[PDB]
Design a protein around this nucleic acid. Sequence first.
RNA 1: GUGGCAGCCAAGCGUCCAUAGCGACGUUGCUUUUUGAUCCUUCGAUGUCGGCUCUUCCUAUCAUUGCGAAGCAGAAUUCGCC
RNA 2: GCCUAACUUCUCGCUCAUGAGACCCCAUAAAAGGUGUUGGUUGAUAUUGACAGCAAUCAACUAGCCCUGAAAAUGGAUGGCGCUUAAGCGAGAGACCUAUACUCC
Lengths: 100, 132, 179, 201, 51, 188
Amino acid sequence: SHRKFSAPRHGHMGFTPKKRSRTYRGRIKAFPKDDKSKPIHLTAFLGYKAGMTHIVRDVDKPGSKVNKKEVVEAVTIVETPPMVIAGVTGYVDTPQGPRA
Amino acid sequence: VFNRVVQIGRVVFIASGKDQGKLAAIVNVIDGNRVQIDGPSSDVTRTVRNLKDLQLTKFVLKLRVGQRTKGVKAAFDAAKVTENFQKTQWAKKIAQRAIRAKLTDFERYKLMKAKQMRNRIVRVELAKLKKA
Amino acid sequence: PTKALGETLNEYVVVGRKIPTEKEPVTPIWKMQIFATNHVIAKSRFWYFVSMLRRVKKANGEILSIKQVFEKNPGTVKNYGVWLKYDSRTGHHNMYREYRDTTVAGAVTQCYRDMGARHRAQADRIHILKVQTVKAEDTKRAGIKMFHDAKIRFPLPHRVTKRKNLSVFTTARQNTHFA
Amino acid sequence: GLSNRAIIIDGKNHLLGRLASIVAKKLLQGDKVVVLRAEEIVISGNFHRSKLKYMSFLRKRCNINPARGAFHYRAPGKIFWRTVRGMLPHKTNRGNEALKNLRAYEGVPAKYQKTKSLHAPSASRFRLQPRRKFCVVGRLSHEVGWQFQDVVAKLEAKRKVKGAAYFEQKKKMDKLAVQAKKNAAPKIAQYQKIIEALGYN
Amino acid sequence: IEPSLRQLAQKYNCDKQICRKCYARLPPRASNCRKKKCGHSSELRIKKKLK
Amino acid sequence: MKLIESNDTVVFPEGVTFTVKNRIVHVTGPRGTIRKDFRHLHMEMERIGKSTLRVRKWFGVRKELAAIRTVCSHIKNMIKGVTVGFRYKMRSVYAHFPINVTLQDGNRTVEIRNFLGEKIVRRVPLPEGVIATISTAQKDEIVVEGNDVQFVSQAAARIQQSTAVKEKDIRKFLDGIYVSEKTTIVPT
RNA sequence: GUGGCAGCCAAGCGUCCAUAGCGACGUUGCUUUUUGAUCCUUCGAUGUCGGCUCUUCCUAUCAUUGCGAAGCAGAAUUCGCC
RNA sequence: GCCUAACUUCUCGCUCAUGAGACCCCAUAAAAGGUGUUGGUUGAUAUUGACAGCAAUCAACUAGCCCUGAAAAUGGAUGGCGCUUAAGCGAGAGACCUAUACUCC
C-alpha cells in the first residue's frame, strides 16, 4: 500500500557507509587535470584548522543589494607552514590503471 | 574482383564427396546451388553436384549447353586439361600428399636423416651469408 | 499424418478397380501416378484419392498392379511445372510452381520442401494435381527463367569452408575470397 | 588430447558465444586457456541490441544490498570470462577448477607479446552473412563503463609498430635463407634427391 | 514578408502531412507513416491548413 | 529471390579521374579530390575501360540491390563536386527582427543573432572543406559552398535547424534561415 | 461477473467538416488498487481497521526536461510521444 | 554448441525484431493494421514499343516469417549462458547418445 503522503528520503545514500574514515589524513581521490602549457606548479598543500573568526569586507557585486556595502562574514584560519619536498615518484599507465 | 566463374565449360575440381580429388567440366547449371558436371576422361560420371563440394580451376572448355559425354570427352582430350592441371602447384601438392601418406617406417627414417643433413648444410651456408 | 519422408520421393503407377459384383460384373479400371516414400504409402494414397473421386473404398476395391517408375534419362536437365492444391491455416488455394531438375520425382520432392519452407505446409495438406515438363519459353517464374541463358556465369562470392577432420584451433589465416 | 602448454588464442574477429563454448569445453577437458585482445571479440546483431542487453543486465541487483547482487564487470576480458563462466558448472568443484584455468586479457601482455596465437575458424565472424551488423566488445565495454579503452589502444599501437619492425627483419632473414638454400644446392643435391623422392621438398 | 519568402517558409512548416496515429510530421506526397510505433499507418491527414 | 547479377556504371567526363580500389574511390578533378569509403556494402567496384566505373552485386536481395544506384549516385555527386562544386543559398525570413548573421573564428563559425529578438547567440561550426559567405548584393542571403555535397548540405541543415521557434505555432511564426536554392558554384 | 483501464467500424456532434477533440448502435481486449464467486492452504492460533513513522517499487504522467498535433495568433488550455 | 552423454554433421528455403524466436499438457493473447520481405490468385496494359522524367508495368486480393496493437509493482528468466547463411522458423538425410523397457549371460 502506497504511503499516504509523499516525503523525500532522509539523507544522501551516496555518502554511505557512515563509517569511520580508514585514515586520519585526507586522501586526494583526484588531482586537477594537467595542462602541459602552464608553468610547473604544485596542486595541493597541507595545513591545520586553527580556528574561526569573522571579518568585515566591502562587497563588489554589481546588481546585488549589498553592492558597495560592508558585510560581516565568518572565516576559518588554516595554518600552513612551508612543506619540504622529500622524494619524487611517477606513474605509468597500464590496462588496469596507473601504477607507481 | 572475381576472375573464375561458374560457366558452361568451366573445369571444376571435386573437393569433397563421392569423386573427391578429380576433375570435371560444368555442362549445365540447374540453379544457384547445383551444377551438372561430367568428367568422362577423369573417371567422373555425368551427375548433378552441389557447388559447395566443388572448386573452380583456371581452365574453361569450349563446350555447349548440355554437351553430351562424347563432346565433353573430345574437348577435354583436345585441351589436355589433365596435363596442364598436373603442372600447377594445386596438383603438385596433392601428389606430394599422396606420396607422403604412404611412407613406410624405413622411408620415414631415411627422410629424417636426409632432411636433417640438408638443414645442417643450409644453416652453414646461411651463417656464411649472414656474416657478409 | 502423411509425411514426405525420405530423400528424393519415389514415383509409382498404381492401377486398381472396384471388386466386381453381380450387378456390375465388369468395373472400370483406374490408374494414378503417386509420389511417396514406398509402395505401402503409394497404395494408401491411391485409395485416398480414388475414394475421394469415385464411390469406392479400399474395402470394396482391389489393386491390380503397382509399379515404380524410373526416370528415362537422368542425364538431362528439364523444367518441371507443378500444379498443386493446398490448405492454409485459413483457406484452400491452388498454386503453380516451377523447378529445374533431372527427375520428375526430384522436382516433386523440391516442391514439397519448398512448400514447407515458404508456407509452413505439411505433406498432409498438399495435393499434387499435375506435374509436367514445360519448355524453356513456356516458363513463367523468374527464378527458373534466369537460368535459361547460354552465357550464364557467376562466381562464388563469400565462401566459408569448414575444416573436417583436424583440430579446432589453427594459426592459419582463413580466406573467404577465391579468385 | 591434452595440450602440453596453455592454448593462446587471439580473440579478434571471433564470435563471443561460439569462442566461449569452445574454450569452456577445453577448460573442462583440462587445458589452460589464455585469450588475448578480448576487446576485439565480436557479437552479432546491431550495437543497440547488445547495449540494451547489457543495460538490462546492469538492472539486476539485489534490492536489499547491491554489494551482494550481481557483479557487472565492464572490462572486455571480464565480460568474456563471465560468458565462459555461464557455460560451466561453476557452482561445483569441477566447474570452479575449470574456470580457474582461464585468463582473458585486453591487448597482449608482455608475457605473450612474443608467442603465436591460435584461431577457431568455427567461431570466426566471417561465417555471418556479409549484410549483418555486429558489435565490438571493446566499444560495448567503453559505453557501459570501461575506463581503459584509450590506454589499451596506445599500447596496442606501440606493440604493432614493434611487430612491424620485427616482421621486416624476419622477411630479410627469410630471403637470406632462400639464397642460402640456392647456394648450398650443389652440396645438398644428394639429400634433396631423397627428400623430393619421398615427397617433402 | 514577401510572398516568395512566405512560400519558402510554408514549404517547410505547413505543406506536410500528419499521421492520424502518431501525429508524425510527414512529407506531403506520402502513402505511409515512416514511424514503427504506428506500424507504418497508411491513413494520414494533411497538416491543418490556415482556415 | 537472389538475382544472379545486377550492376550499374558511372561514366566520367573529361578532366576527371577516379582510381577505385578496395571499395574506396578517389575521384579527382579541377577543384581537388574527394575520397569516399564504400566498405559498408559488399559489391565489386572496378574500372571497365578508361573512363567507366562499374559497381556490381552478385546474388543480392532486394535491400542490397537497392544500394547499387545509391553508390552510383554518390559517385556522380563526387564528380559534380570536383567539377562544379556545390553551393546552397539560404534566405533569412523574419516578421520584425532582422536575423543578423556573421562569421567568426577565421570564417569557420556562423553566428546568428536577434533571431525573433532573443538575446542568445547561436553558433554553428563549419565542417572542414566548407566555406560560408554573407551576400553583400542580395540582402538576407547566406551561401554555403564546398566540394562534398554531404558536408555542404549538413552545414546548411545545421544552420536551418538552429533557428527553430519554440512554444509558438510554426504555422505563422515562420521566421528562420531556410535553404532557398541548391545549385553549383561554377555556372552550369 | 462487477470495478478500473485501453482498442476496432464510423451514425452523428464539432458554424461547413465522421476521425483537431469526441464518438452512438455494436464489438475486441487488458488489470487485479473494488466487490463478488470458490473453498485449495492455515482452526494443538499467520495478532484481525485506521492513523503515525520509514524504505523501496510500478507506472495507466499531475508537475518538471526534450518533443509532435490542435477548432495552437499569447497567462492559460487540450491531445499524444520518449 | 557449452552446462550435458551424443554433430558447431549433410540439403533446400524463410526471418533482422532499439532484448526476434526457440518444441504436448504448459504455464495467456484478440478485433484490427504495415508500400518490411517472400511466395501465390485473379483482372488488365505492354514491343501496332507498357508505367516515371521533362522492358515489363498497373490494380485488387491472398498467406508464410517479421513489425504495431502489447501497461505493474524486490532483480530475473526459451532452464542458464549464449545463438543471427543460427545454437531461430518449416521440410528432410545420415549417424550418434540414453531407462529399472527388449534380447542374451
